[PDB]
C-alpha cells in the first residue's frame, strides 16, 4: 500500500504562544526571573482563570512592572494557565527561571475613581 493523510494532521499548534488569540487580544510581557528570584505577585482563582490578586514589592513582577492586579494569565512560556491553580501557576514559575513570556490580558476596566 501507499498513502498519507492530507488534512489536519497532528496538532500544529506548539510553535510558541501567538499574539492573535482566537477573537481577542492578549498582552505579551517578558519578565526576567533569576534562578533564585521570587515572582512577588499574588493571584486569585477566578471562575476558571488565573487573575492577579496583588503585587509584592521587590518582586520580579513589580520590578519589571509588567504585571498588574486584574491581569488574566493564559499562557506562560507556552504552558497553559487558564484553569490551573494558583499553586500550580506558582509552582510553575518558581520552577521556571529567566525571561518568561507572560501572555495575559490587561484589565483596562474603565472606571474613574
The gap from C-alpha 86 to its chain's centroid, in whole angstroms, comes to: 12
Identify whether the C-beta of residue 45 lies closer than 8 Å to the C-beta of residue 72.
no
Q: Name 15's Cβ contacts closer than 8 Å, sequence gap at least 6.
A: none
Smallest Cα–Cα separation from 106: which of 41, 51, 31?
A: 51
Label the pairing between strands 27-33 and 98-105.
antiparallel
Cα(45)–Cα(84) distance, rounded to whole angstroms?
9
- Helices assigned H by DSSP within 1-112: 60-64, 86-95
For residue 76, report the phi and psi dihedrals to the nearest 5 degrees.
Answer: -135, 105
* Other Cβ atoms within 10 Å of 1 Cβ, number: 2
19-106 topology per CATH: Pdz3 Domain (2.30.42)
Label the pairing between strands 79-80 and 41-45.
unpaired
DSSP structure class, residue 76:
E
C-alpha cell at 66: 509588567
Measured CA to CA in angstroms, residue 46 lies from 10, 13, 110 at distances of: 31, 26, 20
Instruction: Report domain extents, the chain.
Output: 19-106
Amino acid at each position: 500500500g501507499s498513502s498519507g493523510s492530507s488534512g489536519p494532521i497532528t496538532d500544529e499548534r506548539v510553535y510558541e504562544s501567538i499574539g492573535h488569540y482566537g477573537g481577542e487580544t492578549v498582552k505579551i510581557v517578558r519578565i526576567e526571573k533569576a534562578r533564585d528570584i521570587p515572582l512577588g505577585a499574588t493571584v486569585r482563582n477566578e471562575m476558571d482563570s488565573v487573575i492577579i490578586s496583588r503585587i509584592v514589592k521587590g518582586g520580579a513582577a513589580e520590578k519589571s512592572g509588567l504585571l498588574h492586579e486584574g491581569d488574566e494569565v493564559l499562557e506562560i512560556n507556552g504552558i497553559e494557565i487558564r484553569g490551573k491553580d494558583v499553586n500550580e501557576v506558582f509552582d510553575l514559575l518558581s520552577d521556571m527561571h529567566g525571561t518568561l513570556t507572560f501572555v495575559l490580558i490587561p484589565s483596562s476596566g474603565p472606571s474613574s475613581g
